[PDB]
Amino acid sequence: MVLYFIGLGLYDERDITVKGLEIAKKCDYVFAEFYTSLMAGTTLGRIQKLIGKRIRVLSREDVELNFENIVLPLAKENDVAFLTPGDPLVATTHAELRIRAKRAGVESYVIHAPSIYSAVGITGLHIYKFGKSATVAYPEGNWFPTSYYDVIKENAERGLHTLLFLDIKAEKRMYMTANEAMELLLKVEDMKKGGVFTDDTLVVVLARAGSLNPTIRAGYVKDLIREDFGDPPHILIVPGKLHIVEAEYLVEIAGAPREILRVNV
């Protein structure tokens, strides 16, 4: 009669909360989705070993089209867990699943976990200064989406930071790198000429948040565009004007050039 939405956290199998783990262990059935994002620091096998139960993986179609035929029927007479990378319901499509549960007469509860949305606090940038967020999508064929560029423009003009989620082909486990994102943005700039993203733009790259050894780097595009930030996942942030405290953290912790202390504050 109960469905638990449980977050797995940021990077590996230990990023789930104690609450999430203990509840998952006592569930009769455990399902999981890895299409909204991936858990780069672990494997399905390691998550399964930790929880001590078979993990039934579901595709985007299984969920979006058949959630009520696959998960809810069992949740009706058993305790069922639905694992998701990060924090449940951050992904835009997850919320509606609780309405499906209600419609089916199934109680649902949410067990939170760390999300990249909040983990970016490790960049030293003040969380309250983050504006609207966006996703940088790979252009394909004759389609060249650029809405993320406008998001940066609107946040930056108001002195706000912009969190940029990078494209991920979950199924193929292929990640867009911060370098690729920077090239795209430079390409978009050359087309819109909005003076939003150039070689002189200060950016912050956060890779493998959740790991004990994430890569946190800050600097100008001209210098970071060909830098190796390590294995995925990568997150790109275009900060707005900096509070001196934010700048000092970027210099001392993220290796930012001293120049940001006088150019970006």
Looking up tokens 């549960």 gives: 101
Q: CB nearer to ligand SAH: give 16 or 166.
A: 166
Counted residue by residue, the chain has a size of 265
Total residues at interface with a copy of itself (CB under 8 A): 64
Among 3, 6, 21, 47, binds a copy of itself (CB under 8 A): 21
Q: CB nearer to ligand SAH: give 51 or 168.
A: 168
Does 263 engage in binding with a copy of itself (CB under 8 A)?
no
Q: Which stretch binds ligand SAH (CB under 6 A): 101-109, 141-149, 205-213, 218-226?
A: 205-213
> Binders of ligand SAH among 123-162, rule CB under 6 A?
none
Contact 6, 53 (CB under 8 A): no
Does 217 engage in binding with ligand SAH (CB under 6 A)?
no
Among 20, 36, 152, 225, binds ligand SAH (CB under 6 A): 36
Does 90 engage in binding with a copy of itself (CB under 8 A)?
yes
The minimum distance between CB 190 and a copy of itself, in angstroms, equals 25
Among 56, 60, 112, 187, binds a copy of itself (CB under 8 A): 112
Note if the bond before 73 is cis, omega within 30 degrees.
no
CB burial string 38-67: b at 16+ within 10 A, e below? bbbbbeeeebeebbebebbebeeebbeeeb
Give every CB contact of residue 34 below 8 A, 6+ residues apart in sequence.
Answer: 44, 57, 85, 170
Distances (CA, A) of 78 to 26, 73, 107: 11, 9, 11
User: What is the DSSP code string of 87-136?
Assistant: STTTSTTTTHHHHHHHHTT-EEEEE----HHHHGGGGT--GGGB---EEE
The minimum distance between CB 210 and ligand SAH, in angstroms, equals 4
Does 134 engage in binding with a copy of itself (CB under 8 A)?
yes
Q: What is the dihedral of CA 198, 201, 154, 244, to 10 degrees?
A: -170
**Which residues of this protein are in contact with a copy of itself, per CB under 8 A?**
7, 9-10, 12-19, 21-22, 50, 86-96, 98-99, 102, 109-110, 112-115, 117-119, 121-122, 124, 126-135, 154, 158, 160, 165, 209-210, 212-213, 245-246, 248-249, 252-253
